Design a protein around this ligand. Sequence first.
Ligand SMILES: Nc1ncnc2c1ncn2[C@@H]1O[C@H](COP(=O)(O)OP(=O)(O)O)[C@@H](O)[C@H]1O
Ligand SMILES: Nc1ncnc2c1ncn2[C@@H]1O[C@H](COP(=O)(O)OP(=O)(O)O)[C@@H](O)[C@H]1O
Ligand SMILES: Nc1ncnc2c1ncn2[C@@H]1O[C@H](COP(=O)(O)OP(=O)(O)O)[C@@H](O)[C@H]1O
Lengths: 552, 568
Amino acid sequence: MENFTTNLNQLARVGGIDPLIGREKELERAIQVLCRRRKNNPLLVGESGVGKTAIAEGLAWRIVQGDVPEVMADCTIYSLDIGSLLAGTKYRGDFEKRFKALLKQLEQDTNSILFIDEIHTIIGAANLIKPLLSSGKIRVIGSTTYQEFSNIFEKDRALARRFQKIDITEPSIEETVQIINGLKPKYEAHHDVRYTAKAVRAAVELAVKYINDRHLPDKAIDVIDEAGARARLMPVSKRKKTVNVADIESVVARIARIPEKSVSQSDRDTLKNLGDRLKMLVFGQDKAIEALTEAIKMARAGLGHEHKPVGSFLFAGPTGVGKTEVTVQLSKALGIELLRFDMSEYMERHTVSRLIGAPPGYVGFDQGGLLTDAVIKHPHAVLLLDEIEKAHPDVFNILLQVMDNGTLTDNNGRKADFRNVVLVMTTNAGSTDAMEEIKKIFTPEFRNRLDNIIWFDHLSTDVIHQVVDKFIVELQVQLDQKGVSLEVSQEARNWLAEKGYDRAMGARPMARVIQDNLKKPLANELLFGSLVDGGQVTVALDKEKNELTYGF
Amino acid sequence: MENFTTNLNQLARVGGIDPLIGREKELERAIQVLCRRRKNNPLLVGESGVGKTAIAEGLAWRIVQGDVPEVMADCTIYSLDIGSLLAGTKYRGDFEKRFKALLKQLEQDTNSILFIDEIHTIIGAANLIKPLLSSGKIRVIGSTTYQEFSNIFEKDRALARRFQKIDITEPSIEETVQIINGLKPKYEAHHDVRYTAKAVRAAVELAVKYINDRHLPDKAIDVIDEAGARARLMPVSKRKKTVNVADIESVVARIARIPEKSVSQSDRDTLKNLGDRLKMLVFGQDKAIEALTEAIKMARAGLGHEHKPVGSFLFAGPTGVGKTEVTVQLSKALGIELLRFDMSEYMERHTVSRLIGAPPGYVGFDQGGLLTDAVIKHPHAVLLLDEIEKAHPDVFNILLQVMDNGTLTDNNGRKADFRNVVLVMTTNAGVRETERKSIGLIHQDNSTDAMEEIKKIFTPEFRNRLDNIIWFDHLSTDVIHQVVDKFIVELQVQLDQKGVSLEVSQEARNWLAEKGYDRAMGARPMARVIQDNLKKPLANELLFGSLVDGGQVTVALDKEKNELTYGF
Ligand SMILES: Nc1ncnc2c1ncn2[C@@H]1O[C@H](COP(=O)(O)OP(=O)(O)O)[C@@H](O)[C@H]1O
Ligand SMILES: Nc1ncnc2c1ncn2[C@@H]1O[C@H](COP(=O)(O)OP(=O)(O)O)[C@@H](O)[C@H]1O
Ligand SMILES: Nc1ncnc2c1ncn2[C@@H]1O[C@H](COP(=O)(O)OP(=O)(O)O)[C@@H](O)[C@H]1O
């Protein structure tokens, strides 16, 4: 095996192997398994990036250090390269020849162990070692995921009985702190930096909160190494080597595809003026913004509940008052995604399965869910549900279980975390009369689970003028990107506000009115070339025409 | 030896390497990745020829200029030229002994970084770089594309725990112009010609609508090279060093073989008169054509949302009135391709997955979905989705997502550009309700408005995003007469090619037109009725001795409303 495997004893004795911390229980289990006469083959069951490989390295380290029982001494752990072993054969006899050469070079040392990292690729071959590792001469250290184990193992019972499953789980928060503490000095030596304990704990907690593609002990080490690299690059500004919590938050936002610094302390600057910058983007219903921002700050302060969503908000009031506008601006401010669903399509009995997914064996199972799928895709978004009072009661039971426990289960068994989303529900139901109306239509078991009910009052005529001026200034800045100025007379604004607004529809027709009255005429003048770079658009209302006139 | 490992730092010092234009944040990412103690091997994923070698050359140059932290300020970089070590052996043992020799040589050359061009092809002598992975003390920068990345790296833990993908996107228009200007003086020296900044500007602005082979910073330079070569070679006695935008469009017409006058010399002229251009080829539906042209013009004006698609229109009304022909002539007028899909085949979600390119449902998910690859091939084309009311509601979800954001990502790390695509769907829903016979003694009882059935079929979430909803009316008697006359002249061409002349009375044309027109299918049964009423008796005569090689047949009607055949 001179060219097929790596002598891990020769490697832990020189360097590169890092000390394994907090795995005394699993190491003892692997040792106890290795002391058996027959079937002394440990199998490490875990997931990607949990430190399965670190177990074998720590075992080789304790071997070369002598921190093992004397029965376990003198053993040599070999890590084979499957690239050299399996690939490049291309014929019916070469792979078995390589395999038998490896087995013979293992036979000369009856106390040596072979460790095959990720042993699910060589198996599906496997019938060549089942009689060798059954009870005869060879002990093998296996490392697989739970999925690869439950898929390839447990089917070949002859191989399931020839291996000892060692349940490697991901370490807890404090164990991650201890592991990264033990691993700190090496990165400090490489990057010539220093990590504060506050930065360490913050990095672990932020990796848990935002980075959900890997598991704890590896993504945490990755974020510290990345912070160390960033602080080693910072001498382009000739800064100090200390790595604080700010660098950790920056690198976290860099990695989790999250807006920069939108995680811990710039959030203080945003929540300082959250209600204000909302009231500059939404007009009217300002007490609604006040209560909503109050609840948002209440949740962000760390005083909320972990087994409930960030907030369960009901937006009661007539349409066109900006509930969706409040929601989308809340999403844009906090740098979180937006999830939008309309319960108009889930009012039927059979439609409920579209959210979580059909049970196995039925149509649309491999489609998975839509709610749980989006939530797993974007765990920090704000959930928007239009017309909740239309949803079929099964959707209401789903939402009840969500608001009560803050987690959902995909039809593939995955866990959808809702503790980081803001559950926002809007209705077009709508004061005390609106409250009594809400008591009717909504079951008390649902209302009792709500965080806060937010009422949206009717839009006032000055507010309609303000929103039409908002449309006008948006069109103005859009034209300024083109380079054409625009004038709109006051009576034109009043006519647009009165014509595009309905008490029963709110400001919804305002987009259509703005478009068909302003963009069309101006688009003709601009594209056909009558109005060019340097013109100024005028808007005049004639009561004898009720139309808008213009010029160059 | 040095014939296998090339230090490009010397190339940067001797002026052989120019500084890189832009993409400095990719340099910073690569540097901080090379700074790591573990997983310190950068990987460049992206399109082929977008400046990955250029990124590495600019990074090595910056190290020469010392634009890096003090840890890698003195480090040297090496480029791997596999061909030199590979060729000249033709012996597996010699191949492997050369591999060992180069491994020992680079290990002696420690404290250096080796750049592997197209590492995806080196990994798949796969046992040549595995010594570098097992050693780990050597940093390596590679280059790969999304296809090869998804094929090799995402399934291998030994590679994932070493490499980090650097998503290199194609630069903006102005960044491409900056790169063109940076590479311009040496080519002006080589090609002995002079191009303006407006010349290369119109060059890239034309390439973006001619590019169907490779992205921006891999083709505009080739356009410039072709322009220089032609301007130096096209005239024998003249040497037109002045290379203007007319020269660029001449090269575009010379290479793409589309007439420069139809695409490059017409920027807005056909757009300003698009409506009459369509009305000239489609008989009738003038109101629908006018509405469509006004909508697409309002879109082209640019006073809207740049992310949204060019146009999203639902063509309602009975089929067989030319809505597909309207779309065909719209595609031909804009000079853009026609990407069409008959939504009758996507009534099942396991086919919607194939439409998008979801991993399950279809083999070959490395190539992505149909719609995404199609819009990638032509980011300027028109989209036709017939019978849109048949598609699965997930197609409606995707259409809502596109009409909301104007971009569709793929499960292979690619994006779809819709901001230059116009989407057109056709349906005939509700038109079946215009022929619903009432119960009363009169039972006309309606000129049905299919709008209610339309809003019933398409959820308000979807149709709320329509840029317009175009309604197509019934074809007029003159329109039906023109279309039956077109069928007639087609039959006449066929018969004269056979050698038989044909004549038809105008009354017979009116009869065929008024008989073959169905308010449910428009003029589609016209081909069939023309066939059954004309081609059958003429074929009977053509085979049974009345006419064999030549002859002439006239057509007329009786008082019984029957076709009358007149033989030789
Ligand atoms: N208890 C620990 N002590 C020291 N390092 C650890 C510990 N647990 C995990 N690590 C580190 O986290 C990383 C885990 O990588 P690894 O488990 O080998 O990947 P995979 O499980 O996918 O094969 C390693 O860098 C490892 O050193
Ligand atoms: N309070 C408001 N302030 C500013 N604009 C508003 C407001 N309410 C409605 N609008 C305008 O109406 C359009 C969207 O209305 P929407 O939020 O969908 O109504 P609703 O949430 O009640 O269904 C937008 O053009 C928005 O600008
Ligand atoms: N105004 C017209 N000008 C020319 N041909 C027409 C016209 N109206 C109908 N036709 C003929 O009837 C056909 C109707 O096609 P269409 O309604 O688009 O169905 P499809 O979905 O298969 O494209 C046209 O292809 C054309 O041959």
